[PDB]
Design a protein around this ligand. Structure first.
Ligand SMILES: Cc1cc2nc3c(=O)[nH]c(=O)nc-3n(C[C@H](O)[C@H](O)[C@H](O)COP(=O)(O)OP(=O)(O)OC[C@H]3O[C@@H](n4cnc5c(N)ncnc54)[C@H](O)[C@@H]3O)c2cc1C
Ligand SMILES: Cc1cc2nc3c(=O)[nH]c(=O)nc-3n(C[C@H](O)[C@H](O)[C@H](O)COP(=O)(O)OP(=O)(O)OC[C@H]3O[C@@H](n4cnc5c(N)ncnc54)[C@H](O)[C@@H]3O)c2cc1C
Lengths: 543, 555
């Protein structure tokens, strides 16, 4: 689960995930994931082609500019580095639709000049000192899974850009079994973190969909949320200590107390800072005994609003399972179409459930959730509709690359909102997307779908997928990017936030001042200007 | 539950709480609380005197102007036009010149403060606040906001060499519930509403916050946010940082507010955390939205005795490991067990003084929620406790323990009448440090007091008041008989600062909830790092570049 230095030997240079995993038609004419990595790898999907054809109407480098004296001092440190075109281009992007285009079909305007692979905190201190001495710009990179343009190099940045790659700084340093805390280097991936903890009988439970590649430091930088936050917390509840290298010096608290009142919480000044302040090198995270048992479930509702009302009541009774997601009809069908073999079926909606903990407790909780559900017309729909909509989740981004081969472009986007705004926001956003697409000359009605993906006391996270068959469309990116920007306007007009988890990066910068207020924005600026006065950390995210 | 403008008409000018509530000796010579407000009010406490005689070595027979208001005439003229209520009276200013640290109360009892507010203003809304901070910019004034006046960190004290006119900006008349949103289970409130009045008014609608810090009769929303307050039932309701969904803050730079009411976002560093724990140094928190819950169906008290404190700590740790802490669980050492016992009804004889009765520790429990869930959870928790030698010690004992928390602060004022000085202090620490930290802190206090010439061994006692996944909050009480000692305040303050050294050397935090104020400033940089100190400074310099908010807490 360690990312090798030459990423492209294992990962796709032009898309998501591993080289050995891509959808193909098997010898029975049916979509199938290549390779052996996933529970769905090698599993025929006999209705997936039918669903895709129905849904979309288809048949089926810049030179390296680097100071010689800097390079001389770098050689003395014995830190590994590269000026090769493939290494630099690989770290010049995340996973936004726009970037993945430039990467398949052209070239970016600016890419890092040099890649460095520090293996520890001290190496990071060396590199930030060199950047001060030689006037260099640093863009940190972990998993490279940003969906906010947070890795894109500014077109007019004229300094040498270092891509400071954290993927070789990836060890668990200590596991404290008395306090259930693990102290880890920040380049460790979710997958490798969980694998090594599980050999001791522990987990963190933090499971964002990008966990095979995304890193501890990246989660802290972007305020990451994982599928099971209902039991384990999101990144801000999980982290108890961190250590950060900035050009001003090293930020670290002197104790590992679980909660303190010692002024404004400086951990919150670093969480969500998106690579703009320094490098998070190590963090202490809460750990838990691995649960004894897991069960998936699902519930059908006669429509979406009944489902949303049921999720709301579950959150009011504070008895959410490990994960509870509510899919609208299109998303459900997407799922139903993906099996390996009453209620009006047009508005019929489906919640998927995941329970984990002790066997006897799990089965007791499962009963309670189905009883709350019955009050809203909800009927149990089975583990496999459950089991499968969550085996599904690590594969959806492999589907996006398949669409591009067939002239389909799609992206997801998200928001959080008060409970009382969820139904209208979902309906109005989906309709805004349909309206814009028609107005922009999109021939076929787009895929425009939502799910409720997390529940909170005060409201929910809502996740949208938007995609269309771009047949007969001149400029399919510009249509798509205008339509995304429009949906965000619609989100914010309906009381939703700028982002629940993806973050702001450079994609949503233009709305930030309005979201956090002028003085709010002025405060983020003031911390930046103190900690990094010469803007070494210049990816220009946020501000 | 609204604090009136002239506080001294209802509240003690020289101590904690209500004028109508104090301890006095009965017509039979038994200690008794006056008045009618608490469960213990008008209840004679026949053994309390002995306990005080035994713990402090005293008898209990042996008992024990203002600066001018400096204010610019033009300012005052513009203030008159706003119709904002104000006062230059010495008793209104003196009342707002202090919180509830021992030193301050001692100073109110035996003399005068070096610096007190020049004028007290009572805004009734966010717009009045905006007007007042505009005036302070225009006329170069200093503002110290005050809500309940319950700070225990010197957070209200006026800096002696502050030469500008100081406004005490009192929030107590800004106390409305602006809306209660039953769909989202949130209430948006003005920041001067007290805990007690907020809970009273929500309960009429079927709701509560569940945030119950021991000072809730007088401490306010704005205060809790400023100081990162923690309340008794955080295990169910959350501490202040989990409870706050939105806030509006007036600073000299302008108003800070997010544009939405979403429950969790990722829009950069969370600016609510720049404000929480700012202790009055950045601006005035005027309004805040807070989570609310239906009032619980049922509450159930309980208690459990363990063979010693260590076993009790190991049992709390297992309950935290199983994530099944009740709404409140507190473990008291043997000295607090003995104390609580000395508060009962029974009049003992004057001729009489499997568990060891003086090693035994006791935990008090409270569960609240739906009756069915409560009772299964109680059974779960008692099953765990038995594994550690725990024996159920009765619900009456748990209920009495809970009530007692609101009356302890009146006990402090009683000790002052009899030459006894005391204070509580607190920390948070990892699980693996708790037992050693408790033991070493208590022994440091005994050692310091002996070395400084205190005659009798001091009261030095502790309890575990909150469990977390990664550690616990530990609360200490320290008191001695200072009869015989020259400089009582210097001895106390020196022993207190020594204890804090011991806490920090044993892996405890600088504060779990009371905060930093001006009392703990000298450890702050070491606690949060030099760069983290610097980052706090940069926000303060941006938002308040002329230091209008000048109480000089933190930094
Ligand atoms: C298919 C897919 C599924 C996803 N699902 C989820 C999900 O469930 N939940 C969720 O929250 N997110 C999700 N994301 C978004 C992304 O995975 C998260 O934002 C994640 O935290 C990024 O981590 P990274 O290590 O990949 O960071 P990168 O992409 O490498 O960097 C993100 C930003 O952090 C900065 N940065 C990186 N590491 C450091 C460091 N050590 N110190 C300082 N700055 C740093 C970078 O400069 C950049 O600004 C998903 C993305 C994709 C493409
Ligand atoms: C007997 C006793 C018991 C206590 N128990 C607890 C407890 O269980 N938990 C706990 O956390 N604390 C407790 N405390 C501490 C104290 O009550 C809390 O810190 C409380 O949060 C302060 O509230 P207040 O309204 O009294 O604020 P004040 O003391 O009036 O103000 C505290 C600080 O906040 C600033 N301030 C006040 N209002 C605002 C505003 N609207 N905007 C900006 N700044 C403001 C002040 O300038 C001061 O610096 C206790 C104190 C006492 C004496």
């Amino acid at each position: 689960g360690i990312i090798p230095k030459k990423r492209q030997e294992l990962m796709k240079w032009n898309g998501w995930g591993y080289n050995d995993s891509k959808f193909f038609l098997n010898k029975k004419g049916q979509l199938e994931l290549t390779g052996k990595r996933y529970p769905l790898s090698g599993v025929a999907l006999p209705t997936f082609k039918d669903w895709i054809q129905n849904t979309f109407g288809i048949n089926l480098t810049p030179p390296s500019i680097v100071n010689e004296d800097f390079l001389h001092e770098l050689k003395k440190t014995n830190i590994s580095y590269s000026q090769e075109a493939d290494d630099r281009v690989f770290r010049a992007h995340g996973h936004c639709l726009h970037e993945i285009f430039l990467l398949r079909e052209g070239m970016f305007e600016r890419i890092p000049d040099i890649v460095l692979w520090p293996t520890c905190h001290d190496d990071v201190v060396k590199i930030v000192n060199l950047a001060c001495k030689y006037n260099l710009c640093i863009i940190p990179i972990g998993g490279g899974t940003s969906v906010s343009y947070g890795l894109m190099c500014p077109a007019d940045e004229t300094r040498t850009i270092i891509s400071l790659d954290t993927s070789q700084m990836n060890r668990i340093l200590w596991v404290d079994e008395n306090n259930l805390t693990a102290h880890v280097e920040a380049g460790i991936t979710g997958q490798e973190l969980e694998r090594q903890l599980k050999e001791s009988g522990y987990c963190t439970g933090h499971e964002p969909d990008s966990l095979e590649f995304s890193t501890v430091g990246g989660w802290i930088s972007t305020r990451a949320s994982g599928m099971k936050k209902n039991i384990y917390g999101n990144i801000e509840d999980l982290v108890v200590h961190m250590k950060v290298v900035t050009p001003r010096g090293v930020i670290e608290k002197s104790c590992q107390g679980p909660r303190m009142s010692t002024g404004p919480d400086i951990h919150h000044f670093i969480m969500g800072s998106e690579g703009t302040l320094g490098v998070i090198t190590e963090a202490t995270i809460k750990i838990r005994p691995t649960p004894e048992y897991q069960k998936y479930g699902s519930v059908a509702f006669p429509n979406f609003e009944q489902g949303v009302a049921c999720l709301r009541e579950i959150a009011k009774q504070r008895c959410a399972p490990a994960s509870i997601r509510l899919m609208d009809n299109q998303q459900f069908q997407f799922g139903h179409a993906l099996k390996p073999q009453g209620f009006d079926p047009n508005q019929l909606s489906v919640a998927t459930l995941l329970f984990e903990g002790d066997r006897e407790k799990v089965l007791q909780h499962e009963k309670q959730v189905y009883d709350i559900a019955a009050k809203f017309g909800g009927l149990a729909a089975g583990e496999d509709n459950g089991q499968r909509g969550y085996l599904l989740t690590y594969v959806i981004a492999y589907m996006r690359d398949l669409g591009l081969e067939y002239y389909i472009i799609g992206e997801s986007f998200e928001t959080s909102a008060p409970w009382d705004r969820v139904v209208d926001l979902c309906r109005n956003v989906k309709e805004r997307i349909r309206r814009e697409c028609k107005e922009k000359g999109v021939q076929f009605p787009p895929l425009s779908t939502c799910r409720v993906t997390q529940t909170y006391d005060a409201g929910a996270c809502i996740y949208f997928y938007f995609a269309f068959n771009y047949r007969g469309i001149s400029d399919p990116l510009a249509v798509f990017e205008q339509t995304e920007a429009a949906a965000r306007e619609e989100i914010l007009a309906n009381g939703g936030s700028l982002s629940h988890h993806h973050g702001v990066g450079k994609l949503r910068k233009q709305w930030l001042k309005e979201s956090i207020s002028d003085v709010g924005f002025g405060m983020l600026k003031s911390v930046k200007d103190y900690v990094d006065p010469t803007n070494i950390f210049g990816n220009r995210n946020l501000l």
